[PDB]
C-alpha cells in the first residue's frame, strides 16, 4: 500500500497549502499517516466540519491541484501575513487567494467557473474574520461582507464575524474554510462584497481504496 508519511503536516494543512506542507503538493496515497505532533504554522484558521473535509480528501487520495484562470476584477490579489511567513517574508496558503480592497473600494465580485471536464471538482475556499471594525473597513471597505458560493444544485452564503480571539501567531482574526464540489456540467459562481478568501483552481477527486491513519509509528 502506498503510504504517504505526513511528517509534520496534517492532511488539511497539506490540502490548503501551509508553507511547510508544500512539500506535499500533488501527492497521492493509499494511506496518509498523520502524526500526533503535526502542527500549523500559518494564518490561524478553523474548519466547520473538519471531520468530513478530512474524511473526503483522505478517501479521495490525491492532492493534485489544477490552477484555474479566475479573474479578480479590481481588488488586490495575493495577500500575505507574517503569521504564514513563506520564507524571509510574509505569505499565505499556497492554494488560497486572499483578496483585499482596491484603491478605496471593494466591488461586488461575481465570477463564474464552469465544470467542462468529465469529473467532479473539489473547491476549497474561505472567509476572513477581522477582529476589529478598523480592520474590516480597512481591508474590505464595506464593513459588512458576505460570501455566496453556489452551483445549480447547491448554495452557500457565509457572513463574517468581527471580534476578538486569542492571539494565535500574532493574529486575533481567523479564517473559516468551506468547500464545494462541482459535478460535471454544473457551474461554480463566487459572489461577494468582501472578506472572500478566494480559490485558485480545484483539486481532482478520485474514488478508491484510500484513507488516513493517525500514528507516530516508523514507516
Amino acid at each position, epitope marked *: 500500500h502506498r*503510504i*504517504l*508519511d505526513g*511528517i*509534520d503536516c496534517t492532511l488539511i494543512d497539506a490540502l490548503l497549502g501551509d*508553507p*511547510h*506542507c*508544500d*512539500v*506535499f503538493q500533488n*501527492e497521492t496515497w493509499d494511506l496518509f499517516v498523520e*502524526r*500526533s*505532533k503535526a*502542527f500549523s*504554522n500559518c494564518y490561524p484558521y478553523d474548519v466547520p466540519d473538519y471531520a468530513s473535509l478530512r474524511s473526503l480528501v483522505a478517501s479521495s487520495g490525491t492532492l493534485e491541484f489544477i490552477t484555474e484562470g479566475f479573474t479578480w476584477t479590481g481588488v488586490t490579489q495575493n495577500g500575505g501575513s507574517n503569521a504564514c511567513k*513563506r*520564507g*524571509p517574508g510574509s505569505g499565505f496558503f499556497s492554494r488560497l487567494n486572499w483578496l483585499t480592497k482596491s484603491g478605496s473600494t471593494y466591488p461586488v465580485l461575481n465570477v463564474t467557473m464552469p465544470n467542462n471536464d468529465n469529473f467532479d471538482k473539489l473547491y476549497i475556499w474561505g472567509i476572513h474574520h477581522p477582529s476589529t471594525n478598523q480592520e474590516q473597513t480597512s481591508l474590505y471597505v464595506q464593513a459588512s461582507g458576505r460570501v455566496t458560493v453556489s452551483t445549480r444544485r447547491s448554495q452557500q452564503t457565509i457572513i463574517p464575524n468581527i471580534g476578538s480571539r486569542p492571539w494565535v501567531r500574532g493574529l486575533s482574526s481567523r479564517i473559516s474554510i468551506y468547500w464545494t464540489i462541482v459535478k460535471p456540467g454544473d457551474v461554480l459562481v463566487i459572489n461577494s462584497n468582501g472578506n472572500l478568501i478566494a480559490p485558485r483552481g480545484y483539486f481532482k477527486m478520485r474514488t478508491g481504496k484510500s484513507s488516513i491513519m493517525r500514528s*507516530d*509509528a*516508523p*514507516i
Partner: antibody, heavy 122, light 113 residues
Framework: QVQLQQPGAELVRPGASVKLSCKAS????????MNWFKQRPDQGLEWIGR????????HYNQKFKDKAILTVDRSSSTAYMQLSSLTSEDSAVYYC???????????????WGQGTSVTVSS | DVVMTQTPLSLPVSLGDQASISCRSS???????????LHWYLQKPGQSPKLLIY???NRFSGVPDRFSGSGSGTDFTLKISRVEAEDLGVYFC?????????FGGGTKLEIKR
C-alpha cells in the same frame, strides 16, 4: 515548531570524553532517524553516524567507529553522542539532525540543531 | 566513499545576477529504486545548514522559485536566477544514496557591491 536543542559550547580537557545532548522537540523522536555531523572550521562537514531512536539501531562511519557512541533516551526525547579520548582534531562544531528515512518524500535531513562547539584544551 | 566535488569555490555575483554552483560525484547517485538522493544545503555564516533543494530538483519548504537544481547521475547544479542580498552564504551539495553520506566542500557565494 520542530526544534533540535544543542548546548552551544563545551570545553573538554584532552584525553577525556564529552557526552553531547540534542533534545528533540516539535515532532516524535522515535518516528524518524538521527544523524550526527562534525564540521571542522575549515568548512568540512563529516558524517559521524546514525541512530534509529525507535530501537537504537546505530550505524557509524568506520572512521568514528572507535570514538563516537550514539544513544538516545526515549523518555526525554534526548539523543546523545559520546566522544572519548578527545584530541585537538576533535575540536569542531557538532550537529545532530532529523534524518528523514527513505520512506519519506524527502529522505535527507531537514532540521539541524544549533550545533555545539567542542574546545579540546588544557 | 563518494566524493562530492564542487566548483566554484567562491562565487562573486552582483545583486540581480545569476549564480551557478556545480557538484560532481565520484559515482552515480541513482538509487536502486531509481531515486537520486542528491541535496543542496545553505549554511549562512554563524548558523546551521538549511535544506534548500532535495532529491536534485525539489524545493524544500520555504525556498523561493528563484532557486533551481538539476543533473543526472554524477553532475548536478544549483542555479539562482536572480541573486538577492540575503542569498549571501555557503552552499554544499551532499548525497544520501551511498553510506557514508558525503558532503561537498562548499561554495562560498559573495555579493558584489
Amino acid at each position: 515548531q520542530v526544534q533540535l536543542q544543542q548546548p552551544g559550547a563545551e570545553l573538554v580537557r584532552p584525553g577525556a570524553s564529552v557526552k553531547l545532548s540534542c533534545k528533540a522537540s516539535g515532532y516524535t523522536l522515535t518516528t524518524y532517524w538521527m544523524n550526527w555531523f562534525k564540521q571542522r572550521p575549515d568548512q568540512g562537514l563529516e558524517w559521524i553516524g546514525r541512530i534509529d531512536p525507535y530501537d537504537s539501531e546505530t550505524h557509524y562511519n568506520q572512521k568514528f567507529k572507535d570514538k563516537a557512541i550514539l544513544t538516545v533516551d526515549r523518555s526525554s526525547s534526548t539523543a546523545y553522542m559520546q566522544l572519548s579520548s578527545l584530541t585537538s582534531e576533535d575540536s569542531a562544531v557538532y550537529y545532530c539532525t532529523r534524518f528523514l528515512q527513505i520512506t519519506t518524500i524527502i529522505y535527507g535531513m531537514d532540521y539541524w540543531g544549533q550545533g555545539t562547539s567542542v574546545t579540546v584544551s588544557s | 566513499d563518494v566524493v562530492m566535488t564542487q566548483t566554484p569555490l567562491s562565487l562573486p555575483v552582483s545583486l540581480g545576477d545569476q549564480a551557478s554552483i556545480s557538484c560532481r560525484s565520484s559515482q552515480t547517485l541513482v538509487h536502486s529504486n531509481g531515486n537520486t538522493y542528491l541535496h543542496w544545503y545553505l549554511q549562512k555564516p554563524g548558523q546551521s545548514p538549511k535544506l534548500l533543494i532535495y532529491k536534485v530538483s525539489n524545493r524544500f519548504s520555504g525556498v523561493p522559485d528563484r532557486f533551481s537544481g538539476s543533473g543526472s547521475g554524477t553532475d548536478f547544479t544549483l542555479k539562482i536566477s536572480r541573486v538577492e542580498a540575503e542569498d549571501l552564504g555557503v552552499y554544499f551539495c551532499s548525497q544520501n544514496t551511498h553510506v557514508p553520506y558525503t558532503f561537498g566542500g562548499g561554495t562560498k557565494l559573495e555579493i558584489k557591491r
